[PDB]
UniProtKB/Swiss-Prot annotation:
Gene: LYZ
PROSITE patterns: GLYCOSYL_HYDROL_F22_1, GLYCOSYL_HYDROL_F22_2
Protein name: Lysozyme C
Organism, as annotated: Gallus gallus
Positions contributing to substrate binding: 101
EC number(s) stated in the UniProt entry for this protein: 3.2.1.17
Keywords: Allergen, Antimicrobial, Bacteriolytic enzyme, Disulfide bond, Glycosidase, Hydrolase, Secreted, Signal
Amino acid sequence: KVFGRCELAAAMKRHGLDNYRGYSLGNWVCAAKFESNFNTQATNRNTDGSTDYGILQINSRWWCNDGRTPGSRNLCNIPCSALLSSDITASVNCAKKIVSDGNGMNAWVAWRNRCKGTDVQAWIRGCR
Ligand SMILES: C[C@@H](O)CN1CCN(CC(=O)O)CCN(CC(=O)O)CCN(CC(=O)O)CC1
Ligand SMILES: C[C@@H](O)CN1CCN(CC(=O)O)CCN(CC(=O)O)CCN(CC(=O)O)CC1
Ligand SMILES: [Cl-]
Ligand SMILES: [Cl-]
Ligand SMILES: [Cl-]
Ligand SMILES: [Gd]
Ligand code: NA
């Protein structure tokens, strides 16, 4: 599924992401835009053999099982394929554990380089 901006904000807000660990809703929509272009089905292969999955490009090295990332962890206890669903529940619960782990939203390279220090509220501007 490719989400609209307002549609994704209302779904992330309903799953409790708004101000989660002090990160306003604008930071999360911004991250999703530059990680996946709002597409749940996005995948990107990393040079170490791990793969990034879904709207927030979560990372088979540590967070989920794709059966092809040797000696990796599954700390969200999910198949990576669950992170590609039109339902973002798995992606959101998994992101709650990542952003809680010590480095906050710096875990998302595109958030750090394209959202951090900007007018992030612009990303939910006009939404009900
Ligand atoms: C809401 C309208 O803006 C829709 N829109 C009309 C055309 N826009 C005009 C403009 O945005 O000023 C220019 C192109 N636009 C650049 C950009 O958005 O930054 C990329 C495509 N957009 C992406 C989007 O808007 O989400 C969809 C089409
Ligand atoms: C040409 C306009 O589209 C100018 N636009 C500024 C104003 N936009 C317009 C809008 O989308 O309504 C509102 C804020 N916008 C939200 C979003 O696009 O998702 C993020 C910033 N954008 C990033 C981008 O377009 O890639 C900068 C370019
Ligand atoms: Cl915001
Ligand atoms: Cl594996
Ligand atoms: Cl933090
Ligand atoms: Gd824009
Ligand atoms: Na794994």
